[PDB]
């Protein structure tokens, strides 16, 4: 056992290195797309459905990001504790949390709790790619849009019942020792203004700012989901390294 856990710790150290590399390789695209979104928003009307807060919100879609392998110490436990706290907060605000899950551990935890899971994705929490993030963000954004026409508990003209908010619970990787489960409202986005930077030479927009903003907001959502998945993978590897160090020391 000591041999197995020591091997697992060394493998986890290598995997932490790789996950940090991946987290760093996605930073430039995130920065550029954020800047492009800032420009388009500055040169557009801020009325996109994703930006406007629904009146009488009553359903929030919470995406809980857990792992697949269970050798992490308290990674999944902390993530699920934060998810439960967020559920309590949503209940306080009179919102029914519909649930999406990433990773098998959270699937099992919620199955034991008899909490219905609208959808789940598994098998990539160790090394998530952008395709997985795109699929998850597509599903979440489709649900949020379907929540636009819903009234009372009726799907409305959509034919499908949606959500009025989107949250992501995931483990943010502060450092090699600090990994904190955090909840983050991904939609609707809080439009906040900043001082004048830039606008002396206006950007030209092809075809026009509104179409680009509509095409780019979902991409920003998917980019943020991808960043969350990468941070979750790094945190999972860090916590697995710590757990295997503890196990090998104990063994």
């Amino acid at each position: 056992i000591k041999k197995i856990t020591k091997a697992q710790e060394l493998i986890a150290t290598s995997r932490i290195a790789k996950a940090q590399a991946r987290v760093e390789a996605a930073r430039p695209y995130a920065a550029e797309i954020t800047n492009m979104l800032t420009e388009l928003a500055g040169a557009s009307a801020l009325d996109h459905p994703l930006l406007v807060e629904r009146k009488q919100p009553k359903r929030a879609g919470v995406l809980v990001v857990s792992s697949d392998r269970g050798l992490c110490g308290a990674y999944n436990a902390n993530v699920l504790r934060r998810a439960e706290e967020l559920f309590s907060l949503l209940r306080d605000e009179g919102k029914d949390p519909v649930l999406y899950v990433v990773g098998r551990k959270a699937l099992g935890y919620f199955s034991f709790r008899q909490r219905t899971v609208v959808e789940s994705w598994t098998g990539f929490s160790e090394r998530p790619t952008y395709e997985n993030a795109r699929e998850i963000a597509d599903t979440l954004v489709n649900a949020f849009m379907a929540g636009a026409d819903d009234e009372g508990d009726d799907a409305g003209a959509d034919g499908i019942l949606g959500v009025d908010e989107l949250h992501i619970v995931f483990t943010e990787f502060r450092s090699m020792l600090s990994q904190t489960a955090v909840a983050r409202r991904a939609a609707p986005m809080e439009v906040e203004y900043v001082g004048e930077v830039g606008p002396r030479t206006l950007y030209s927009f092809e075809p026009d700012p509104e179409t680009l903003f509509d095409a780019l907001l979902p991409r920003y959502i998917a980019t943020r989901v991808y960043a969350a998945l990468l941070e979750a993978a790094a945190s999972e590897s860090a916590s697995r390294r710590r757990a295997m160090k503890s196990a090998t020391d104990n063994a």
């Binding site: 706290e85 809080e190 439009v191 203004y193 001082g195």
Partner: peptide, 21 residues
Amino acid sequence: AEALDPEDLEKESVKVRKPAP
């Protein structure tokens, strides 16, 4: 379960380079 502090819930935002309206 003790619910989230509403301030502890990070909010995704779209930065706009304009003065507040």
